[PDB]
C-alpha cells in the first residue's frame, strides 16, 4: 500500500510517501509531488529486483505523519527502528543502518570514512548502502558526508542540505 501526504514547514512544502504492508517497506520525500511519485517509483522498482512484493494502492494511513515527525526532531530516529520491516535488506545493509541511526545523532555528522571505520568496512561499501536506502528521513543517511564536501545523496543535494539545516548544521 502507498500513503502520500504533504506537510508545511514554513514556506517550503515537503511531500513524504511510504511504501508500508504491516510494516514500512519504503520511504520518499521531495519537494512536489510529480518528483515524489518518480522517487516513489524508483524505489519500489528497485525492492521488486530484489523479491520485494509491492503494492502502490493508495491508503489512508499515519506513517507519513510519523516520518515527518521524524523530520522536524519530535520523534527520534532510534524510535522508528521498531516499524521498519527492512524487506529487501541485505544483512550488511541493515548492519549499517542500524548503526546510523542509533549512533549518529541529530545536529552531527559523520563522513564516509569514518562510517567505514567504526564498521571494519570500506567507504565504497557505506557509499553503496546509502544510495540504496530505501528508509530516507528516518534512517538519517544525510548525516554522511564527504570529508571535504556536502557529499551525494541519492534523493538530491537540495533535499540534503533542507535536513541539514532542519537539524541546525
Given at each position: ?15 513524504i510517501?511510504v ?8 520511504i ?35 506513517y507519513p505523519?510519523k516520518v515527518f515527525?521524524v ?66 528521513i528516518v ?31
Amino acid at each position: 500500500m502507498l500513503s502520500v501526504e504533504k506537510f508545511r514547514v514554513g514556506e517550503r512544502v515537503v511531500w513524504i510517501g511510504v511504501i508500508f504492508s504491516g510494516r514500512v517497506q519504503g520511504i520518499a520525500f521531495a519537494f512536489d509531488r510529480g518528483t515524489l511519485m518518480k522517487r516513489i517509483h524508483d524505489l519500489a522498482e528497485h525492492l521488486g529486483k530484489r523479491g520485494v512484493s509491492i503494492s502502490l494502492d493508495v491508503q489512508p494511513s499515519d506513517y507519513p505523519e510519523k516520518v515527518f515527525k521524524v523530520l522536524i526532531g519530535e520523534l527520534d530516529n532510534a524510535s522508528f527502528l521498531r516499524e521498519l520491516s527492512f524487506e529487501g535488506v541485505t544483512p550488511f545493509e541493515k548492519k549499517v543502518y542500524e548503526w546510523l541511526t542509533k549512533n549518529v545523532k541529530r545536529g552531527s555528522v559523520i563522513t564516509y570514512g569514518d562510517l567505514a571505520k567504526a564498521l571494519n568496512t570500506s567507504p565504497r561499501a557505506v557509499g553503496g548502502a546509502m544510495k540504496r536506502n530505501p528508509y530516507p528521513i528516518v534512517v538519517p543517511c544525510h548525516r554522511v558526508v564527504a570529508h571535504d564536501g556536502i557529499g551525494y545523496y541519492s534523493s538530491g543535494i537540495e533535499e540534503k542540505k533542507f535536513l541539514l539545516e532542519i537539524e541546525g548544521v
